[PDB]
């Protein structure tokens, strides 16, 4: 393929200890004579699937575990198979974070959680609540200081506040259909954030570099950040502490907890070299120390070394916050969830959208895959078998139910009129089984200006193909067909779909 044999290319994010990781690479190189190269590309979490989708990219990819389910779903990750003895060296719950559809898809490295980081010289007793921060900022401003600065350009940092009074991503009691991005709890949290901005206690333009600089220069009493940030604070000589996030409406802030993880490119011809590196060089006391001494990892997955790091009050703080939060899902639409909420926070903070409308859009964006799949899967199946699914629609049931009713009505005419066209198209494609389904969805996408009619024709071809698959005793292929059409639709037409308020707009358009 495109990835070079006999060497290792490793990608890790720019806020992590990539110089320390390179030291581990240098030791691997010394032992074996095999080159290891560490890179930290911009927009890593977007660059990796771009290049890997064509069989290119790094042998080894590092990111929090939340992104890896999507990567695995898209066929970009190799299944990893550590022996029992190696598995038992790491905490079982860290392997859980990197299991997808029953398979391990990455090596867990470390548990990351956000904490409140405060300047002990300015603020010897950090606030226990978010609510007292406006008053604290007024006191500090009289001294030429501010109370709090953190990255507002990434939803990770604001999420703890959103989740505090009841906001959630996908319900965990998982029911993926149940999404809590625009409930009252999420709205209260984001509204508090926006009020801080409108009362000049924070600035909507604040990003990672700006907040880090302000804290490390001693201009702001507090920031919110993970363990990787501590190294630069050490260098700056600020007298800092790491503690529990403030409560909001008497409830703990609930950070989304990430497990830094290393995956192996499905297209790498160096999977055994990667395995050797990750298991016998990185995931050891010495390997993890080399990275940790560069930028702190947090609470590492390796039991032996975590027993040492656990005595650190900053790690104790980290795990305190982690226990109040929640391990991230790794479902394939986590990416779409984060994009949706990123846009909602930035738009609300800038005043481009009200909090209510911003979160409504993030709700629709986060629900889009599962809602679309429910409708499309049911349509394809009932079209293939001739009989409807009588199972309850579930959450947002009126929308799914009314969209399916609309799709049946409009779809009947589209299929009748396009029958000749569809027959010709199918014949040219030679679709025999599930391996043909992947390529099919892509071609279906292309075959300009977005409108619902074009989307009905797309789905109707899907139904036509579903009937064919049923007829040739490949009824098992219908659900991956449905999943593939859905993925194509919601990814390529995301912004338009959200602008229509999703399937509610479809129902309204054809009323
Ligand atoms: O902001 C959305 C973003 O959040 C998380 O990314 C974290 C990452 O986990 C940390 O290791 C650190 O690098 O900060 C990032 C946020 O800037 C999710 O892991 C990521 O997928 C998501 O897009
Ligand atoms: Mg809207």
Residue numbers in the entry: -196 to -24, -20 to 253, 257 to 320
Would you copy out the relevant sentences from the publication that reported this structure?
Specifically, cell death-inducing mitochondrial permeabilization is prevented by tight sequestration of membrane-localized proteins by anti-apoptotic members of the BCL-2 family, which include BCL-2, BCL-XL, BCL-W, A1, and MCL1. Consistent with its frequent amplification, MCL1 is highly expressed in many tumor types, and high expression levels of MCL1 contribute to tumor development and resistance to chemotherapy. There has been intensive effort to target anti-apoptotic members of the BCL-2 family with small molecules designed to release pro-apoptotic proteins from their sequestered state.
The Gly-Ser linker that connects MBP to MCL1 causes a 45° bend in the nearly continuous alpha helix between the MCL1 and MBP domains. The mean B-factor for the structure is low overall (~20 Å2), but increases to 40–50 Å2 starting at L235. Taken together, these results imply that K197A and R201A drive the overall packing of this crystal form.
